[PDB]
Amino acid sequence: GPRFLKVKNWETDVVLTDTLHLKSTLETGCTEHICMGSIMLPSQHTRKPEDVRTKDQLFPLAKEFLDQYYSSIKRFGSKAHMDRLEEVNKEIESTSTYQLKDTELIYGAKHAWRNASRCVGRIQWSKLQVFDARDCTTAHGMFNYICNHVKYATNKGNLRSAITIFPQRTDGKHDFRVWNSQLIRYAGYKQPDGSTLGDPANVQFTEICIQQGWKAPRGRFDVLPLLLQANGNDPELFQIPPELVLEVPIRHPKFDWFKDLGLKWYGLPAVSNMLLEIGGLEFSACPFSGWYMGTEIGVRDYCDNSRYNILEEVAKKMDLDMRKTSSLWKDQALVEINIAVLYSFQSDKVTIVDHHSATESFIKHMENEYRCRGGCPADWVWIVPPMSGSITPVFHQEMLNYRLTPSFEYQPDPWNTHVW
Amino acid sequence: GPRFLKVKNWETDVVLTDTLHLKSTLETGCTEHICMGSIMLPSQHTRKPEDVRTKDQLFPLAKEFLDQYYSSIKRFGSKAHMDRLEEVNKEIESTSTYQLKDTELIYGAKHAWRNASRCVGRIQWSKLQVFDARDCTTAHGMFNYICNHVKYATNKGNLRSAITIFPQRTDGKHDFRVWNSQLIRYAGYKQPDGSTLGDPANVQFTEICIQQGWKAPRGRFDVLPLLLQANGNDPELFQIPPELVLEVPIRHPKFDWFKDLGLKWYGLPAVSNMLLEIGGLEFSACPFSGWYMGTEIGVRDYCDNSRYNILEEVAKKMDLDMRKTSSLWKDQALVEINIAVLYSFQSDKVTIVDHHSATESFIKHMENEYRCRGGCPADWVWIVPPMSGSITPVFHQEMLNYRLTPSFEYQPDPWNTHVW
Numbered sequence: 062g063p064r065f066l067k068v069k070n071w072e073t074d075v076v077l078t079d080t081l082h083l084k085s086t087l088e089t090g091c092t093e094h095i096c097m098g099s100i101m102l103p104s105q106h107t108r109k110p111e112d113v114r115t116k117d118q119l120f121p122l123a124k125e126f127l128d129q130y131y132s133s134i135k136r137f138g139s140k141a142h143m144d145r146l147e148e149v150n151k152e153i154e155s156t157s158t159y160q161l162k163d164t165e166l167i168y169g170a171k172h173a174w175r176n177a178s179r180c181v182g183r184i185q186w187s188k189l190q191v192f193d194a195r196d197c198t199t200a201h202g203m204f205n206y207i208c209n210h211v212k213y214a215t216n217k218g219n220l221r222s223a224i225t226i227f228p229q230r231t232d233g234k235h236d237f238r239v240w241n242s243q244l245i246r247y248a249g250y251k252q253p254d255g256s257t258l259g260d261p262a263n264v265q266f267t268e269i270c271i272q273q274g275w276k277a278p279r280g281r282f283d284v285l286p287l288l289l290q291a292n293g294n295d296p297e298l299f300q301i302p303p304e305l306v307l308e309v310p311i312r313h314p315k316f317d318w319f320k321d322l323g324l325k326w327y328g329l330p331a332v333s334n335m336l337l338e339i340g341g342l343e344f345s346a347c348p349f350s351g352w353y354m355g356t357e358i359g360v361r362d363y364c365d366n367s368r369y370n371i372l373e374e375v376a377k378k379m380d381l382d383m384r385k386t387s388s389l390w391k392d393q394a395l396v397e398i399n400i401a402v403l404y405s406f407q408s409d410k411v412t413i414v415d416h417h418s419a420t421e422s423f424i425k426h427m428e429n430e431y432r433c434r435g436g437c438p439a440d441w442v443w444i445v446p447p448m449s450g451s452i453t454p455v456f457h458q459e460m461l462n463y464r465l466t467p468s469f470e471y472q473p474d475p476w477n478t479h480v481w
Numbered sequence: 482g483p484r485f486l487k488v489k490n491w492e493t494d495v496v497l498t499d500t501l502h503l504k505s506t507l508e509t510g511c512t513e514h515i516c517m518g519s520i521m522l523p524s525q526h527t528r529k530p531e532d533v534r535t536k537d538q539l540f541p542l543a544k545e546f547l548d549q550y551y552s553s554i555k556r557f558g559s560k561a562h563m564d565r566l567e568e569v570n571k572e573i574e575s576t577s578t579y580q581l582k583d584t585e586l587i588y589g590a591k592h593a594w595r596n597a598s599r600c601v602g603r604i605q606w607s608k609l610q611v612f613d614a615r616d617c618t619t620a621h622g623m624f625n626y627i628c629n630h631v632k633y634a635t636n637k638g639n640l641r642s643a644i645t646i647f648p649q650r651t652d653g654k655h656d657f658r659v660w661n662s663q664l665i666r667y668a669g670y671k672q673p674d675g676s677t678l679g680d681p682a683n684v685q686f687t688e689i690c691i692q693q694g695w696k697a698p699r700g701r702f703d704v705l706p707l708l709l710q711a712n713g714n715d716p717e718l719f720q721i722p723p724e725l726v727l728e729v730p731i732r733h734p735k736f737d738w739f740k741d742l743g744l745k746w747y748g749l750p751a752v753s754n755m756l757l758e759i760g761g762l763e764f765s766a767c768p769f770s771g772w773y774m775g776t777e778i779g780v781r782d783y784c785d786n787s788r789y790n791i792l793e794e795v796a797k798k799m800d801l802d803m804r805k806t807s808s809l810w811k812d813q814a815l816v817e818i819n820i821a822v823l824y825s826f827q828s829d830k831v832t833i834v835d836h837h838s839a840t841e842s843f844i845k846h847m848e849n850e851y852r853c854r855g856g857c858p859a860d861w862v863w864i865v866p867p868m869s870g871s872i873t874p875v876f877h878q879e880m881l882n883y884r885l886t887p888s889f890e891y892q893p894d895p896w897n898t899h900v901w
């Protein structure tokens with residue numbers, strides 16, 4: 062009733078009950094009289110530049126996580142359970158923090174993905190390769206750990222999901238941070254004509270890189286150098302071995318003139334600017350990767366007005382009346398581009414998933430999560446594809462959104478906080 | 482500020498400050514721990530049945546509306562204002578209700594559209610023809626009023642926005658209801674051999690009509706009979722003069738086989754099942770109409786799996802690779818289809834707007850409203866088109882959704898509560 066929230070699919074009339082939401086702790090930004098559900102960053106964890114968890118705040122968080130952990134392995138309240146609780150309990154009193162066991166790290170990492178409401182690929186949550194890198198101490202050690210990750214996940218094209226976790230944060234002792242937004246991403250340059258070469262989204266970062274010595278090739282698809290920071294020290298540039306950055310040349314299965322557009326994209330989507338949170342611990346560096354859903358590249362990266370914005374030129378090549386928006390020429394070109402993207406990746410044998418199947422699998426994931434967990438936090442706004450929304454099952458799916466921990470949060474850009 | 486909610490557009494990086502949300506008092510259905518912004522009927526102030534308001538509940542509401550109404554005209558705290566307040570207050574305790582002047586009714590109708598968070602066409606809000614049918618007493622009277630609306634509104638294909646407001650709710654006389662979801666819509670028949678002929682969304686209503694004496698043509702696009710109810714009396718059937726129902730045969734500007742798909746739609750979209758609420762008064766019968774956005778018919782009405790579901794047939798004809806969804810045949814079919822729809826209308830001089838022009842307009846509207854009004858409640862989930870969402874400006878725009886009064890609300894189906 063008042064607690065048994067319901068979610069129904071208006072296409073298949075199936076109604077599911079959500080109880081998991083009750084275990085929620087954090088706030089969504091939505092109040093009783095207003096809904097912020099479309100606000101990108103409610104700032105309810107963009108982790109401002111201030112203090113951190115207190116010895117007090119930290120244990121309860123640990124207790125909850127540890128309790129979660131033992132229920133899952135079917136050892137709730139067991140001596141082993143009580144034991145690690147006092148152990149962690151003591152560890153914090155003395156050290157003002159603690160360390161997670163390998164079993165606890167893998168679990169929490171897989172669950173920060175399971176609770177990522179904006180992710181449509183969470184049906185893969187249980188298959189994640191965790192790379193404990195907490196022993197790292199330098200920018201060179203970081204680069205080695207990263208290269209190993211990029212190579213493991215790219216797997217010659219047969220992508221694999223994986224995440225690398227570097228040393229948890231401390232306090233005024235400083236921390237680790239990958240300054241890139243993603244391990245692999247093209248550069249962006251501002252032309253004299255006010256125009257912009259390459260990826261407009263990475264313009265400021267690229268200037269940081271070139272400003273730190275990087276020799277920019279000044280091309281359309283220039284892979285950026287890694288700008289790793291360790292222990293709270295100045296970041297150090299590091300170019301990724303080219304044979305390790307898999308790329309796909311985009312071509313259409315009908316338009317021979319497609320290749321002529323000079324389009325290409327990278328195979329591995331690895332987000333690296335987020336913060337993994339487990340048992341109260343903040344992991345400022347935890348690059349993770351999986352594989353692309355066509356539209357990410359095709360619709361968003363290529364056609365976004367702010368990104369490459371290739372719709373116009375692609376329309377011309379098709380000979381479409383771009384005079385009236387009523388022709389739906391932007392729409393027509395858009396479907397062609399994304400057909401090209403899935404075509405290439407598939408031809409080059411690189412892993413990728415189209416929005417139709419991706420969204421369908423997510424519906425099964427949802428049916429699973431309700432069945433075995435009693436819920437599944439989902440951000441409708443993010444979960445629905447940025448093209449052909451209506452024809453995907455998730456458009457008619459009603460989703461409940463709440464914040465569960467372990468989780469992935471946004472955090473400030475290191476160059477708006479790093480002194481010197 | 483710390484109470485001046487700021488919304489941003491992640492394409493132009495334009496940030497607007499909303500102070501208007503402060504004037505809302507009603508529930509959204511969300512809390513700090515949960516967001517139900519993707520829930521269709523977030524049961525949080527829909528429109529309770531049984532009895533109705535009360536002297537206690539009514540005056541404050543009426544007061545809020547009037548102070549608001551007199552501020553619009555710039556007479557707050559004037560003689561007309563003060564005197565008007567007391568007349569109402571007086572008339573309420575005596576008659577246990579009150580009537581709205583003709584000026585206050587037009588202001589309420591218009592502003593209930595202005596506050597419709599799920600409407601993208603709101604730039605027209607001020608341009609509205611209000612038809613006062615508060616003198617109506619019988620179904621035959623209701624039909625005459627409806628007929629006059631359809632004609633004024635249709636205007637030979639040069640559509641005009643209008644609304645017919647019937648008598649408000651009382652207690653015992655009883656509601657005036659239009660049992661039809663939309664003034665003009667096609668029937669749906671579920672054949673014994675599983676199939677559904679015509680619109681599957683109208684199968685339930687069609688069965689009521691047939692049960693009330695309607696003789697069914699039993700076809701694919703049979704315009705349904707009006708089923709009207711006056712003063713709480715049993716509803717009665719009324720056919721709408723064919724010459725009053727403007728229709729449009731759908732054809733494609735390049736594909737001549739489209740003609741043979743056998744499609745046509747009505748040019749006038751008139752919602753008639755919502756409840757208009759003004760100054761505490763509830764108008765159960767208030768059909769309203771404007772003009773269509775291409776996608777409503779092209780994506781939703783024609784392509785939804787639970788409606789006319791015509792993607793397959795169109796694809797085969799186009800002969801797309803329907804073997805694997807990575808060919809995006811569904812995306813390709815959906816575009817041509819919507820091109821055909823916008824084509825057919827514009828050719829038959831029937832008013833219609835494409836999702837590109839609409840969203841571009843809702844944006845300028847939002848900005849103007851933030852300027853003059855201080856905000857604009859909007860529902861991202863409904864405002865973004867069901868196709869090519871990201872290439873439309875609204876997708877990259879943040880929207881604050883909240884409840885303002887006057888407003889249009891959902892109300893139970895008349896057949897699930899009408900006694901005898």
Ligand code: HEM
Nearest residue numbers: 174177179180181182185222223349350351352353354469
């Ligand atoms: C099976 C492969 C995967 C697919 C198909 C997938 C797909 C997606 C999609 C479409 C988005 C939208 C991104 C955007 O629009 O910017 C997304 C976001 C996200 N995914 Fe997944 N995902 C996968 C694997 C992963 C992995 C391995 C993790 C972490 C362990 C993860 C965590 C998330 C998070 C945190 C977001 C939020 C992005 C943001 O806030 O900018 N995903 N994913």
Ligand code: HEM
Nearest residue numbers: 594597599600601602605642643769770771772773774889
């Ligand atoms: C000028 C032409 C108009 C356009 C192009 C426009 C467009 C739209 C669209 C695209 C929807 C979505 C409906 C759906 O997805 O099922 C909608 C919904 C809505 N519009 Fe407008 N609108 C127009 C006129 C009006 C008028 C005259 C009113 C009332 C005075 C109005 C009130 C609303 C409301 C209350 C909804 C919510 C529908 C619901 O909750 O089911 N609109 N409109």
Ligand SMILES: C[C@H](O)[C@H](O)[C@H]1CNc2nc(N)[nH]c(=O)c2N1
Nearest residue numbers: 099100101442443876877878879
């Ligand atoms: C303003 C709005 O929240 C923003 O544009 C959102 C909408 N939905 C999205 N959905 C996904 N998957 N990715 C995005 O970047 C966005 N952007």
Ligand SMILES: C[C@H](O)[C@H](O)[C@H]1CNc2nc(N)[nH]c(=O)c2N1
Nearest residue numbers: 456457458459519520521862863
């Ligand atoms: C479940 C979900 O809220 C529902 O399918 C919504 C999504 N957005 C929509 N947007 C519009 N304009 N119309 C709709 O009917 C819907 N349906």
Ligand SMILES: NC(=[NH2+])NCCC[C@H](N)C(=O)O
Nearest residue numbers: 330332351352353354357358
């Ligand atoms: N499938 C993923 N894990 N994607 C992560 C984000 C990738 C980003 N949206 C891009 O397309 O560049």
Ligand SMILES: NC(=[NH2+])NCCC[C@H](N)C(=O)O
Nearest residue numbers: 750771772773774777778782
């Ligand atoms: N443009 C409008 N006023 N539309 C009102 C709703 C029409 C409805 N979505 C339909 O396609 O039948």
Ligand SMILES: [Zn+2]
Nearest residue numbers: 091096511516
């Ligand atoms: Zn919300």
